[PDB]
C-alpha cells in the first residue's frame, strides 16, 4: 500500500489502529508510536498559516515538509506492521 496526502486520514483511522493491538507489545507499541506521530504531524500541518511571524511562502514550505514527513511515518508504520502480519 502507498500512502499519500489524499490517502492519509482514509488510512490513519482508529479502525486500522485497532488492527495493531494484535501484535506483541514490543512490535505493536513502536508501530503505534509512528502511527500516532504521523497523525499529530499531519493534523498540525497548516498551523503555520495561522502564525504571522512566518511568510506565506515560508509557511507553505513547512506544509510540504510536514505532510511528507507525516506520510513517511504512516508508511513505515503500515509497512512495518504488514511485515509483522497484520493486513489493511
Amino acid at each position: 500500500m502507498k500512502i499519500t496526502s489524499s490517502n492519509f486520514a482514509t488510512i490513519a483511522t482508529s479502525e486500522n489502529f485497532a488492527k495493531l493491538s494484535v501484535l506483541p507489545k514490543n512490535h505493536r507499541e513502536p508501530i503505534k508510536g509512528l502511527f500516532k506521530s504521523a497523525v499529530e504531524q499531519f493534523s498540525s500541518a497548516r498551523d503555520f498559516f495561522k502564525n504571522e511571524n512566518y511568510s506565506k511562502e515560508l509557511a507553505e514550505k513547512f506544509n510540504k515538509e510536514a505532510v511528507n514527513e507525516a506520510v513517511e511515518k504512516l508508511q513505515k508504520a503500515i509497512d512495518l506492521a504488514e511485515k509483522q502480519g497484520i493486513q489493511f
Binding site: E15, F42, N63
Partner: protein, 200 residues
C-alpha cells in the same frame, strides 16, 4: 461530544465519516450540549436554565469571540447568590464556556484578506462552512484542499482560507446524524433523549 485526531465512522449511522470538530454543525452540537445540561447552583437548589435564559446565550458565542461564564453571568443577570455547576480556581468564571473557533477563524480569515467586514455576519452557507472545515481537516496540501473545494466557494475567499486557517480533530458523530440531531436539541432536548428519539 468528545474529540480525537484520528478518523472513524459514526457510532449511530455507520459508513458515515465522523464529523470534523471545526464544522458549524459539530461546533453547534458542542455548544448545544453544554447549554442544554448547564445547571444553576442556587443556595442548596440546582436549577436548569429557562427557555428565555438559553435564548440570551444562544447566538452570543457566534457574536463574540468567546463566552466566558462571567459574560454569561452578566448576560443572564445572575445574582452573586447563584453559581455555575461544574465550574471549578481564582478566576474560573473567565474560563471559556464556548468559543465556536471555526466560525471566528473563517470570519477572521476573510476579513483579514479584506473580503469581509468586522462585526458583520459570516455570510456563508452552513453546509459551506462545514465542508470548508471538513476539507481543511482531511487535507493539508493546498492542492488536495482546493480540489475538494470544487469551486463550491469563490476563488477569492478560498485564497483567504488557504492562507490563515488550520483545523483538526473529529466529534464521534457523523455530520448526517448530527443533521437529524441538531434541530431537536435547539428545541431544548438533550443529546441523551434526542439520540434515542431519532435512532435508538
Amino acid at each position: 461530544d468528545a474529540v480525537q485526531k484520528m478518523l472513524g465512522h459514526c457510532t449511530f449511522e455507520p459508513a458515515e465519516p465522523k464529523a470534523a470538530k471545526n464544522t458549524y454543525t459539530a461546533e453547534r452540537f458542542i455548544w448545544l450540549t453544554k447549554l442544554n445540561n448547564l445547571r444553576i447552583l442556587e443556595q442548596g437548589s440546582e436549577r436548569p436554565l429557562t427557555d428565555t435564559e438559553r435564548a440570551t446565550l444562544m447566538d452570543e458565542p457566534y457574536r463574540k469571540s468567546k463566552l466566558t461564564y462571567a459574560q454569561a453571568r452578566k448576560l443572564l443577570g445572575l445574582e452573586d447568590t447563584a453559581f455555575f455547576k461544574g465550574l471549578r480556581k481564582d478566576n474560573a468564571e473567565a474560563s471559556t464556556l464556548m468559543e465556536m473557533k471555526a466560525y471566528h477563524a473563517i470570519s477572521r480569515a476573510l476579513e483579514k484578506e479584506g473580503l469581509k467586514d468586522k462585526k458583520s455576519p459570516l455570510n456563508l452557507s452552513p453546509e459551506l462552512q462545514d465542508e470548508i472545515g471538513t476539507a481543511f481537516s482531511l487535507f493539508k496540501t493546498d492542492e488536495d484542499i482546493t480540489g475538494r473545494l470544487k469551486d463550491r466557494i469563490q476563488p477569492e475567499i478560498l485564497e483567504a482560507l488557504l492562507k490563515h486557517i488550520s483545523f483538526d480533530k473529529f466529534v464521534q458523530i457523523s455530520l448526517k446524524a448530527l443533521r437529524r440531531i441538531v434541530p431537536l436539541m435547539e428545541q431544548g432536548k438533550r443529546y441523551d433523549e434526542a439520540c434515542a428519539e431519532i435512532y435508538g
